[model samples]
Target: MNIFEMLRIDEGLRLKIYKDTEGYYTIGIGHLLTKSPSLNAAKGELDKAIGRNTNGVITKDEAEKLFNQDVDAAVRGILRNAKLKPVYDSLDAVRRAALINMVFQMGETGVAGFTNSLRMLQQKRWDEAAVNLAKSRWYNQTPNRAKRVITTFRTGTWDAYK
Candidate 1:
C-alpha cells in the first residue's frame, strides 16, 4: 500500500463535519480548521463532495485527493504572499519548511498579520523575530507550535517538537 493510503487509514475518513480530539470543527481525513486559503476556497468543493444536506459521505479516495489539492494551495500561498516570500527564499530548507508549516497552520494571511515578526524576519534579526512570535496571540493559542517555529527562526534547525 502507498503512504497516502496509510495516511487515510491513520487519519480516518469521515464525510460529515465533526469535532476533532481538540474540539475544533474538522472533516475529511485530518484537515484542521485553519484559515488556509485552499480550505476556504474548498468550501464549495466540500459542499459538492459532501452535499448541501451536510449528511453526505465521501470515499477515502476523494478525501485524499482533496487533501493533496489543499496542500498545493498552501504551497502556493507561501510562494505568493509578499511578506513570507522574502524570508522563504532567504532561509535554508529547514527554516523554509518551518515557515511553510507555519503558513499551513496559521494561513498565509494570518502569518502575514505578524507585522513586527515579519519585519524582524526581513531584517534577519532572528532573535527579535523569535521573541516577536513568542509574544503573539498565536503563541498563546498554540504554544508548542509557536515554540517550534520560534526555535527554527532562532537557530535554523527543526528540533522544536523533537
Candidate 2:
C-alpha cells in the first residue's frame, strides 16, 4: 500500500477534537492544534477552533507532516470551489496558488465571502480582483502578506514577499 494509506491505517482518524497525551488539542490522524510558527503559516478555521493555548507540544516533524496533509485538504477544497466557478481553473499557477493560500488562511467558507473579488476573478479581471482584495479587512490585518497575494493575482507570477 502507499505511504499515505499506511499512515492513515497506523495513525487512525479522529473526527472530533481531543487532547493528546501531552494535552495538545488534536484531531484527524494526530494533527496538533497548538500554536506554533508552522501552524500560524497554515492558518485555517481549525486555528480558531483551538485558539491560544500553551498546554500542548508537537515535534517539528509531526507539524510538517500535518501541514502537508492540511494543505492537501485545502487544495482539494479550493478545487471543489472551482467547480462552482470556472474561473478558478483559468487562473495561472501563481494566482491559483494565491487562491489556495487564501483558502488556507481564511477557510473555504470565509474566503467565499469575497464575492466581488471572486466575481472579478471569474471575469478574468485580475487588476480589479487585486484591488478588491486590497480593500478588505484581510489586507489591513496583514498588509505584507496581502500584498504578495495581490501581486500574484495581479501579475499572474510568483512574486514572493521579501
Candidate 3:
C-alpha cells in the first residue's frame, strides 16, 4: 500500500554522503544535497537530517524520515502539476507507484512534459506508454533506471518490487 516501500528499493538506501551518477552530493534515498531549487527553503531541515550523520552512516530512522518526506513531496508534486486526482484515483498501486517514481526523480515539470506518454498511460496503453517513455532523453541519461521504469509502465503489477 505504501508506494514508498517500492521507492525505497528503487532508490536504494544511502545513509552516508556520496556522489550519484550525475555527481550530485546525495543522501538518504536520492535526496540531492546540492544544486536544489528549494535549497534555502529546506536548508534547516536538511541540516538536522545530515547532522545526525556519523561519517559512515546516518541513523536509519532519520534517513527513513527524510525519505518518507521526500516521497510525499513527490506525490503532491504530481497531483499539483497534473491535477490528475481522478486519473490517479482510478489507477492501481503499481501504476500510481510508477507515476510517483517518475515524478520523484524527474522534476514535476520534467515529468509533466511527457504529454504523449502520459496520455498513453491515462488511457492504459501500457506498452505504448512504456515505449514513449523509452524515447526520452531521461531514458538516455539513465538507461538502467529508465528500463526499470518503462517495465513498470509496461507491466502494472508490483514490477520488480513484486
Candidate 4:
C-alpha cells in the first residue's frame, strides 16, 4: 500500500474529516486510537495557504498542519535547499520516506545538523548512519518515531506513521 493507504486514507480505512461541537474540524484516521481536531484552523486554512505560497502546489500542507509551523518551514526549506536536494535525488523511495520522516520530526536545521549521519549515508555506511540517527536529539526525544524511520532507512520500507 502507499503512504496514504498506510495513513488510513485509503480503502477499508475509514477516516472522518468532520467538524466538532466547538466548530472545530477533526480527522480520525486508522483505528479510533488516533484522533485529533484541527489545530488553529490548520485543517481549514492550510491547503489554501500552501497553495497560495507554493504557486498552486499543495503537497506538504497536511503533515505541516498536523505537526506545526516549524515542521512546515523545515520540509519546504530542505526540499528547496540545493545541498539537500541532491541528497534526496540520490535516495530510493524508501530512503526518501525515511528522510522525509526525519525532516518532519527534526526540522531542516536539526536534520542538517546531522553532518556525520549525512556523510555516513553518502558513503553508503548504513549502520553508521542508523547509529547516528539514534544519537540525534530528536531520537532521544521521540524514541518510537526515531525507531520507525531508522527501520525504514535500514530496511527500505515504509511504516504506518499513524
- Model number with the top TM-score: 3
Query: What shift in Å separates residue 48 of candidate 1 from its native position after superposition?
Result: 2.4
- Write candidate 4's Cα lDDT for 1-162 as tens digits: 444333232212223334432334433321111124434444335344334433212333343343354334545777897667667777887687667655644456667788888877766688878888787667776576568778777766665344
Model 4 clash count equals 0
Which is the leading candidate under lDDT? 3
Pairs that clash in candidate 1: none
Candidate 3: C-alpha lDDT: 0.74
Off by over 4 Å in 1: 1-16, 20-24, 28-63
Better of 1 and 4 by lDDT: 1
Cα distance off (Å), candidate 2, residue 154 = 0.5
lDDT of 1 by residue, 107-152 (tens): 7998888888878877789888888788888788767656766887
lDDT of each: 0.66, 0.63, 0.74, 0.54
lDDT of 2 by residue, 87-144 (tens): 5677766667677667765678878888888889878888888888888888897686
Q: Where is the poorest 10-residue window by lDDT in model 3?
A: 36-45
Clash pairs (backbone) in predicted model 2: none
How big is the RMSD of model 1?
Answer: 6.0
Q: Which residues of candidate 2, in runs, are more than 4 Å off?
A: 1-55, 82-85
State every prediction's TM-score relative to the real structure: 0.68, 0.64, 0.81, 0.56
Q: What is the C-alpha RMSD of each candidate to the true structure, in Å?
A: 6.0, 10.5, 3.7, 8.9
Between candidates 3 and 4, the lDDT winner: 3
Location of the lowest summed lDDT over 10 successive residues in candidate 1:
1-10
Measured by TM-score, how close is model 1 to the native structure?
A: 0.68
